Every structure is written in structure tokens, then in C-alpha cells.
Design a protein around this ligand. Structure first.
Ligand code: N32
Ligand code: N32
Lengths: 420, 423
């Protein structure tokens, strides 16, 4: 059964609204900024991809009151608020707003997060250390539970089909899209609102990644330079926040209702390294297998892939592993054009898969491949791979692959074809 | 292939009634309870004083929890308690199944799908307290993977070299019902041959308990008589009793099991999942989303309601929750006949994200042995349940062929899984 995407929503460090975000991305913009001392004061990691408010970004700022009434915001952590805005955008684009119970019952909501409501949870613990646990809000638990992103979206829109919340670290929202497609094919839903949401900035979460030496520290005075996937001087990832959503349905379902497919989902693959808890193997074998499964599903040879949106987070070991995986799948000398948009957005963690899927889809729609900012001295291990430098590449393309990996050895890859 | 019959070939349990499914089963069927007074470090400030706790080998010599049996002592520092329980339950299930592939051909066809509701809450809470006292610069390098929900499946995969899909559904108290449904789905789509599926939860902390107490969801009226506090369907229920544990099943096609000589313990014939889109912490009074999930599982199994012998209800002992499920059961099954219904949360407490997997295991064992667990504490059944065959405290010894198990959660999540006895 053929499956398509009919709507996209984005809340990100480059703004809210996918057209504006796309225009900013291709123009070389960056969402990386110095973090507040309340988050980063104790740490050497001083830079993050932050979502700005309307006062800071009048055109593209985040105002969750447009999707959630003021008095309801108290009931949901930031990631959920972001999820609600991104979902509204994707649904409006897809024109999916079912009033009838039949259609509502056939709409699923599958929204990933990596860490979920960390700020809410941290605040509850801090209350426990101060005012006392007898003073916790009645909303404490659903405020931070990961599945209340999907939950609040479903309540608002009356989506009464399956609910999902994959929490598979930084691959989670790639899996959300694969899980959406799988449900369309098994007949368990007719439309899926799928994606990811993450808003985990807090001294403790940042501190936890810091303690693992996973975060960039050497570019604090030049924040836009800090995220440099594939570059010789990369020194760890830059945490980001945001949310991105896609509306997924069968091609036949889309065309019957007059919805324009934006792109087709033709492949999905997911695997486990079973290697180490926080690093993948140097040979990239788990990631390699995930990519090959998505290509097999799409019946696409490696030489037919035009564009790869790599997971590459700007870690030394992580980017090297993905380089090796890509060489195994595609060879050297020819192959796909490859970039990492984490160079501009930072690492949206459990929302990274969905935002990069969205960029992969827009790349196909527009024949514009995002560049990799800061790619000044490519890792020599990547010689023979067509890594896109800072300039976006304007070229008609048909097939795009997007990767997402996470702690716990999770690899996921999703493959798209241009429509028509 | 979508027409594959799917079976369970091994089961593992870590619970408030012990570790090891056979011992746990014998203790459950004998009317045992895992409910105990919590430590003051957890519940000292709160009026919810009772929990289903997992005991160590000093406290329970035959059935105690010793994670060093599964994980070297040095490595325990790297994993929160929910993961340690997951590891022990997974080892049990895998040993019973005889699934320990050494070749990549089989390793690549083994998935690992382990739910949690809250994940490493004690780990996360400790990191935050460290942050307030000693400073975030003192955090362990293992802080993040210590608590991430998916590191339960992750650590299991690493130990056993399972290289197929990893899953971690975090859909609250329906989560490990969905894990089983997701496992079945993956066998039917051809994405895996064997799935280690289940749930793991160890969320006891003053803040998590405090949060549930703030939602008025916890029992507070039975502190002096802990074993009486979890009373699903009873007139005097006043909220659920939090528990901890892990349970796992090994899922594969019947054809694959027969090929390798593994004995199916039961068959998985149906799964359904729905969303209420009603309220963030309560379902509708008529249980209509639960009803729909149950009917979807029955439809998938091609089973009429009158063919169901046993229902392991979600019923957690909350006033509104159990009443909703009563109404859903009446809609699906009618009144006057219908299945025998019990809730084993009466004995184990609510294992949250691991409730689905443990209750699945009990439903499977019920079919295997022809013994339906009772509902402890059911002294004055809610009148709304008149017409439903609620099992009282005594386990019922009767041959049975079909069992349904429900799991629901905050955010309007409903899931149901349906089993048939094997052969
Ligand atoms: C075992 C080691 C060696 C060490 C050395 C160099 C590194 O690059 C890091 C810092 C990160 C590895 C990595 O990219 N993991 C890694 C991964 O497997 C999957 C995903 C991500 C992600 O960001 O999405 C990720 O970050 C590792 C982690 C830990 C300590 C230092
Ligand atoms: C909206 C209300 C009314 C209120 C009144 C009586 C109740 O019984 C509770 C306390 C819990 C309802 C419930 O069982 N939710 C509920 C649910 O939907 C799904 C799962 C569970 C679970 O334990 O697994 C659950 O607990 C609710 C919660 C909140 C405040 C008081």
C-alpha cells in the first residue's frame, strides 16, 4: 500500500511555521544562541538551539496560546505546548479536521519524545526539596508524562484511534514515522498525526550530557560555529528544542479526499547495535543495516538515492561511525549528496527525526538540498562522500533518506520519494 | 506475513509477589499479597502509605530480587532499578523460550520492545537533588543512560546481542499491553522473527507518589491494613496502590516455534488500541474507548464476546476508573452470562508501565493451568457490576480457552490483548 505525507508542522530554533523555517535554513541561518546562566552557568556547554518567543522573533516566534488557551498552559510542559502548535500547523496543511466519529476513530496520534517533560519533572522534584510534596499541583503527573504530547493533541482534535509514544532516544521520531506508516499498512488507522517534541533544557539534563562529555564546549564565544557535523574540529553536540509533525495517510485516502501529497514514504528500517549504551560501533554496522532495510523496502538501489539527511550530531565518535556506515551502503566516488541540518538547528533529540524528515521532504518538493553549516575541513575519513558544504544545493531530486540514532544502540532510517 | 499465528514461548516476572513466574503464580493463586508499608523515605510526608514493593533475598529467601544474577555488580551503577528488573525478567523469559542466538542471522531477527510509564524516576530525581546540593558538575557520567526509558530494551539487547528493532512505548499504564501488541505486529509484518516484549517500572520516590496523591489517585484509607488497600470493584475502594516490577514474554510465530522445537505456552490472537480523547486523567463514565479497544481485539481474533472465558481487568481500585471499566465490560459482554472477571492488581498493586505485561502473564498462566485468579478484598462488589461474573477472593479452578487482558492509562490510552490456550 502506498503511503504519503500531506501536511508538515515545525516549531524550531529557526522559527515556527515550516515555510519560514525552510527559507531561513536554505538562506544559511542558524538557531544557535548563548544559553541563560540559569541553565548553563555551571557548565562549559554554553550554546543551544533555542525556540524564541514573539518578542524576540516577531515573524517566527513561538506563541503556544495560539493553540492552547492561557488557562490550560498550566496543565502541560513546554514539549507538549510545542507539539500542540506543530500539530495544528501540519493538520491545517493536510486539511484534516474530522468532525464525524468514523473519521475521528480512524485517526491515530503517534508523538515521540527522548526525555519528555524534564523541566516539569525537575521542577516537581525541586518543589519536593522546598515547599514539600504535599504542595504538588494536581496536574504534576500528566504535565510531564511523555505520552501527554500525543494525549493533548488527541483531546483537542478528538482523535480516537491508536495513540503512540516511542521513547527511543534520538531515533524516536524517525520511529514515530515508521510506526505511522506501519499502522496505515496494517489497517489500524487511516490517518496518523506523527512526529516528535522535545524541550529538555535544564541545568541537570544539560549537566548529564556534559558529564558524558557529549556536548560542544569550544565555541561558546561564537555560538553559530558550535555545531559542525563531519568537520575536523567538531567537539560534541549542541542541544536544541522544538517539535515537528507530519500527517501520514495512504495515497488512495489522500487522493479520494483531495489532499495533495507532499512526498511519498517508500521505506523504513530500524535496528539495534547491541554494542554499547552510549556509542555506536566504529564500523557503523547497525546504522548500515537500518539504511539497507529502508532501501530494500523501497526497492531502491543505493545509487538511486539523491540526498541523505544524516543523523550526524557533531560528536567525534558518532559522526565517524555514520561516515563508515554511509561508505558501506553507498561506496565512495559517486553516491548521494549528504548533509546534516543539526549544523543549523542543533540536536532536537527525540524531535530530531521528525524535523529532519520534514527537511528531507521539502528538499524533494523544492529541489533544494540543505547544506552543512560550519563544514570547513571535512573529516578525511569522509573522502569520497559528497558532503554538502554550507551552501544549499539547488538540484532536482527524486529520493531522500533520513537517519536517526540514539543511546541504547537504536538506529532508524526513513526513505522518501518525490510526488508525483 | 499478516496471517501468521503468533505465540508466547517464555515468560519472566519480577514482582511484589517475588521473582520467577512459577513461584509468583503459586503465591497469587494461594491468595498472597505483595502490598507493604512503604519506607518513610518514600511516603513519610504523604497519606498514601502502602505500595507493592519488590523485596530482596534477605526479606524473601525463595523469591527475592537479586539483579547481580543478571548483571555484574560493577555494571549496576550504570542502570536504574527499572532496568535491573527488566534484565532479570528478560533472562527468565529467554531461558524458558530457549532463545539465545549466537549467529547474526537470528540476532538480526530478534526485536526488543520494553515499555515503561515513568522510566528511571528515582535516577532522574537523584540527579536533580544532586544538582541542588552538590552541583550539576558532580553528576555521574552515566546520568543520562542510567534513566532513559529505552535503556531497559537497550541493556537487554546489549547483553543478548539482539540486533533487530528496538521499541519503548511510554503510553502510561497501558504501555506494556501496547508492547505486546507492537511485538505481534512486527511478527505479522515480517520485521522480526522473535520479540522480547514487556514492561518495567520502579518509580517509587516521594515526588512520583506525591504527584499521584495530588491527582487524588492513590489509596489513603488503609494505612493500618496494607493488604486491604488495593480493592478493585469494591464499594470501599479509594484509589490505586503503586507497585514496581517487570514482566516479559518471548513472542514468535507458531511456525517459527515449531521449527525450532520451542513449546508454545499460549497463542496471541487479538490486539486493539484506542484513544478516548476525553480527559487527561480520567476516561468517560461509560468506558466507550475501553469498549472499542476490547471489540477490536475480539474482531482481530474472530472471537464472539460469549466465547471469552476470562478477563484480567485493568481495574486499579480507583472510584471512577473501575466504574468506567465495569460499563465497558457490560457493553461488550452483556449481563447475566459473560466471562469470569478479576483484577490481580488486588494482590500486586499497580505496576504502571509494567502492569500490562504482568497481567498478560497471569492471563496466559490462567489458560495453561485452568485456574483464574481471584480479586482480593472484593467484599462488597460495586452494584454497577451486578450481572457481571466478578471473581471474589478465591481463585476459580475451571478449564478455560480464551482470555482477555486490558490496560488503560492517562492521556486516554486504552489497550486490550486476547489469548487462546495452546493447543
Ligand atoms: C563511549 C563514549 C566515548 C565518547 C567519546 C566520543 C564521543 O563522540 C561520545 C562523546 C559520543 C558518542 C555518540 O555520538 N553517541 C551517540 C550515539 O551512539 C547515538 C546518538 C547520539 C546522539 O547524539 O543522538 C550520540 O551522541 C562518546 C560517548 C561515551 C563518552 C565519550
Ligand atoms: C478527573 C478526575 C476525577 C477523579 C475522580 C475519581 C478517580 O477515580 C480519579 C482519582 C482517577 C480516575 C482514573 O482512574 N484515571 C485513570 C485512567 O483514566 C487511566 C488509567 C489509570 C490507572 O491508574 O492506570 C487511571 O487511574 C479521578 C482523577 C481526576 C481527579 C479525581
Amino acid at each position: 500500500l502506498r503511503v504519503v505525507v500531506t501536511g508538515i508542522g515545525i516549531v524550531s530554533p529557526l522559527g515556527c511555521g515550516k515555510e519560514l523555517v525552510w527559507q531561513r535554513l536554505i538562506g544559511g541561518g542558524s538557531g544557535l544562541r548563548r544559553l541563560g546562566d540559569d541553565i548553563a552557568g555551571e557548565l562549559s556547554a554554553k550554546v543551544g538551539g533555542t525556540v524564541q518567543d514573539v518578542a524576540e522573533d516577531p515573524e517566527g516566534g513561538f506563541d503556544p496560546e495560539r493553540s492552547v488557551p492561557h488557562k490550560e498552559l498550566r496543565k502541560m510542559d513546554r514539549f507538549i505546548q510545542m507539539a500542540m502548535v506543530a500539530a495544528d500547523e501540519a493538520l491545517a496543511e493536510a486539511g484534516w479536521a474530522p468532525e464525524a466519529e468514523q473519521q475521528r476513530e480512524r485517526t491515530a496520534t503517534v508523538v515521540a519524545s527522548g526525555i519528555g517533560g524534564f523541566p516539569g519533572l525537575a521542577e516537581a522534584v525541586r518543589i519536593g526539596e522546598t515547599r514539600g510534596v504535599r504542595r504538588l499541583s494536581p496536574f504534576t503527573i500528566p504535565f510531564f508524562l511523555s505520552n501527554l504530547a500525543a494525549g493533548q493533541i488527541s483531546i483537542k482534535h478528538r482523535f480516537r484511534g491508536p495513540l503512540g509514544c516511542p521513547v527511543t532516544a534520538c531515533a524516536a521520531s524517525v520511529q514515530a514515522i515508521g510506526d505511522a506508516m506501519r499502522m496505515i499498512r496494517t489497517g489500524e488507522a487511516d490517518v496518523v498525526l506523527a512526529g516528535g517534541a522535545e524541550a529538555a533544557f535544564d541545568k541537570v539534563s544539560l549537566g548529564g550530557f556534559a558529564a558524558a562529555r557529549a556536548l560542544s564546549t569550544g565555541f561558546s564565544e561564537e555560538p553559530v560555529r558550535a555545531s559542525r557535523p563531519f568537520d575536523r574540529d567538531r567537539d560534541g553536540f549542541v542541544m536544541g528544542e522544538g517539535a515537528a509533525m507530519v500527517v501520514v495517510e495512504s495515497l488512495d485516502h489522500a487522493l479520494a479526499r483531495g489532499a495533495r501529497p507532499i512526498a511519498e514514504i517508500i521505506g523504513y528500517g530500524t535496528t539495534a547495535d547491541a554494542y554499547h549504551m552510549t556509542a555506536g560501533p566504529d564500523d557503523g554496522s547497525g546504522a548500515m543495516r537500518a539504511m539497507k532495510l529502508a532501501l530494500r523496502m523501497g526497492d531502491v538501489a543505493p545509487e538511486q538515492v539523491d540526498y541523505v539527511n544524516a543523523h550526524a550530531t557533531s560528536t567525534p565518535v558518532g559522526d565517524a561511525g555514520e561516515i563508515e556506515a554511509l561508505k558501506t551502503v553507498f561506496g565512495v566516488g559517486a553516491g548521494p549528496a549528504i548533509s546534516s541540518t543539526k549544523s543549523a538547528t542543533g540536536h532536537l533529540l527525540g524531535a530530531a527525526g521528525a524535523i529532519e524528515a520534514a527537511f528531507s521532504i521539502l528538499a524533494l518538493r523544492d529541489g533544494v538540498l540543505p547544506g552543512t553549516l560550519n563544514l570547513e575541513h571535512p573529516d578525511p575519513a569522509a573522502d569520497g562522500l559528497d558532503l554538502i558544504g554550507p551552501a544549499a544545493r539547488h538540484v532536482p531530486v527524486e529520493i531522500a533518506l533520513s537517519n536517526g540514532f540514539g543511546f541504547g544502540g537504536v538506529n532508524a532510517s526513513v526513505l522518501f520519494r518525490r510526488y508525483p
